[PDB]
Design a binder for these strands. Structure first.
Ligand SMILES: [Mg+2]
Ligand SMILES: [Mg+2]
Ligand SMILES: [Mg+2]
Ligand SMILES: [Mg+2]
Length: 195
RNA sequence: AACGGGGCGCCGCGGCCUCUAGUGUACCGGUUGUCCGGCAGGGCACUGCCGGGCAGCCACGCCGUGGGGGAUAACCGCUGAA
């Protein structure tokens, strides 16, 4: 369905400064400064109009179809996430699961390593991005903290995908006669705010 | 069973001749029948035949022959509205 005018307003929280800048004919750059840090996002080639109105960020479209109109609600979700990112932070929690070979997980500098995954002599090594803090709690839990939800969630997804083999290395999920198979790995259990 | 680690091949490609092998009517030796009077030396038997064999060529011999980056496919995920 066609749309003539649509509008979405996002409420800026206390202590959070937003700078919406135009870097092209339809290109934006949004910098969000908070107590927890500074977030910078790009919105390139967008029909959505971004503007600041007295403590609010204004999103509007004009002559918009369904494809363009749904980008108002998407950008409200993104902008809210960046506000919470610099006011409360994000914490993604992972649980380590194994059956016979315990998975020695350690954080060495900016590298994350996992040992003995299924007894493999090989090592899993993941570079930790800047602005992402990785900690190993106990032997069984991992927490990723940061102010960017996309960057924290992306790294937490790459840890889980590390312990998921593909091709002919993939073990059977179910055991003999329908039982639980060899399911060992690191799984994202959920997310939370640092504060 | 697997990942990861170490070692080597086969097929192909590109070179090389130190070794080994082949050839080597350059060369050296042995020997048959006959002719040059005999010895010596030699012609011919289409290198007469047999053995060895430098160089050159050559393989049946030796040498080299890799990992990475990007955008991607099938697809797997993050965030994420309509
Ligand atoms: Mg000969
Ligand atoms: Mg004589
Ligand atoms: Mg004569
Ligand atoms: Mg002759």
């Amino acid at each position: 369905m066609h749309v003539v005018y649509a509008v979405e307003e996002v409420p800026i929280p206390d202590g959070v400064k937003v700078a919406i800048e135009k870097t092209g004919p339809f290109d934006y750059v949004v910098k969000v400064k908070g107590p927890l840090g500074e977030l910078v996002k790009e919105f390139k080639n967008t029909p959505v109009i971004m503007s600041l109105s007295d403590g609010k960020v204004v999103l509007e479209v004009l002559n918009a179809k369904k494809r363009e109109y749904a980008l108002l609600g998407t950008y409200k979700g993104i902008l809210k996430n960046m506000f919470l990112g610099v006011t409360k932070g994000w914490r993604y929690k992972l649980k380590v699961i194994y059956t016979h070979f315990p998975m020695l997980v350690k954080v060495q500098g900016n590298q994350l390593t996992i040992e003995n995954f299924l007894g493999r002599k090989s090592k899993i090594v993941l570079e930790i991005p800047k602005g992402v803090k990785v900690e190993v709690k106990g032997k069984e839990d991992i927490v990723v903290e940061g102010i960017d939800r996309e960057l924290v969630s992306q790294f937490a997804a790459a840890i889980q995908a590390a312990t998921e083999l593909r091709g002919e290395e993939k073990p059977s999920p179910h055991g003999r006669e329908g039982g639980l198979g060899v399911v060992d790995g690191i799984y994202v259990v959920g997310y939370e705010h640092v504060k």
